């Protein structure tokens, strides 16, 4: 996806499923001390973290038809708890699955429970997955636990050829003919010893 | 076999019937080299190599 966000220049501002469209699940309790919203506690915004509802986490399932006519980058995730007790407290079962499938995709995941050294104070982990729904594809998400629900997708508008620098600088001006990680360059000379990663007529 | 070692499992998920089939078929191929013995074992979701 970095390879794809290298060489792309989209206007990705769309969304699909509702936070509470999912039935009979706690649909507003996504607080985590790892994704702290500053002083408060919260979680990733493009992702909804679902818990049991009144001690009941049923088999939930939704489908998105991509009638946008363009590639839509959907992200979701899956929780790997630290202990079996956490899985019981959150999904009110011992084991669960995440079945995702479209005209192209086909993956059943399962949480894998084990205690690990704490990172941001968490002994559990989260494997995140991304898929590009092609135009007029239909993708179905189905699960009964350990399921990070997709909420905010990305419709890719202008599939271009823009890259991804690791550069320690700041935005500057619009007057340029060629751009490099450390600076801009403005000649039609044939050669440069500046750096290989360049964007523009370089 | 002497070289190959894999246990697969099916992946049941709700997928739009493509050719009228909501399920999928993942196909696999190997090269049994001269003088080898390969063993197939299964209890479902299996296309026998005819």
Hey, are the CB atoms on B12 and A100 less than 8 Å from each other?
no
Using the Cβ of B25 and the Cβ atoms of chain A, whether some distance falls under 8 Å is answered with: no
| Rounded Cα distance, A181 and A202, in Å | 13
Using the Cβ of A102 and the Cβ atoms of chain B, whether some distance falls under 8 Å is answered with: yes
**Tokens of residue A128, six digits:** 């995140």
| Rounded Cα distance, A75 and A47, in Å | 8
Measured between CA atoms, the residue of chain A closest to residue B20 is A103
Hey, are the CB atoms on B11 and A103 less than 8 Å from each other?
no
Q: Check if the beta carbon of residue B16 is closer than 8 Å to that of residue A102.
A: yes
Contacts of A181 (CB under 8 A, 6+ apart): A165, A166, A167, A169, A195, A197
Q: Check if the beta carbon of residue A80 is closer than 8 Å to that of residue A126.
A: yes
Entry resolution (Å): 4.6
Using the Cβ of B18 and the Cβ atoms of chain A, whether some distance falls under 8 Å is answered with: yes
Q: Check if the beta carbon of residue A29 is closer than 8 Å to that of residue A54.
A: no
Q: Where are the alpha helices (DSSP H) in A55-199?
A: 84-91
- Helix (H) or strand (E) segment spanning residue A4: helix A2-5
**Tokens of residue B30, six digits:** 């190997």
Phi, psi of A27 (to 5 degrees): -110, 15
State the best of A63, A67, A106 to mutate against chain B, taking most chain B CBs within 10 Å: A106
């Amino acid at each position: 996806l970095r390879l794809k966000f290298s060489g792309v220049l989209e206007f990705s501002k769309f969304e699909a499923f509702t936070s509470n469209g999912w039935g009979a699940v706690n649909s507003g309790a996504g607080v985590t001390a790892a994704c702290k919203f500053g002083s408060s506690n919260s979680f990733f915004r493009n992702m909804v973290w679902l818990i049991h509802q009144s001690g009941t986490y049923p088999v939930i399932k939704r489908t998105f038809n991509n009638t946008k006519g363009r590639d839509v980058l959907i992200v979701w995730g899956i929780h790997h708890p630290a202990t079996l007790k956490e899985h019981q407290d959150l999904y009110k079962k011992d084991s669960s699955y995440v079945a995702v499938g479209s005209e192209t995709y086909n993956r059943r995941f399962t949480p894998e429970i084990s205690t690990r050294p704490n990172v941001n104070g968490q002994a559990g982990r989260m494997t995140f997955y991304w898929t590009m729904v092609k135009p007029g594809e239909s993708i179905t998400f189905e699960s009964n636990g350990a399921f990070l629900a997709p909420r905010y997708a990305f419709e890719i508008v202008s599939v271009g050829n823009g890259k991804l620098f690791r550069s320690e600088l700041s935005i500057e001006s619009c007057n340029t003919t060629c751009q490099t990680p450390k600076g801009a360059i403005n000649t039609s000379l044939p050669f440069q010893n500046i750096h290989p990663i360049t964007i523009g007529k370089c």
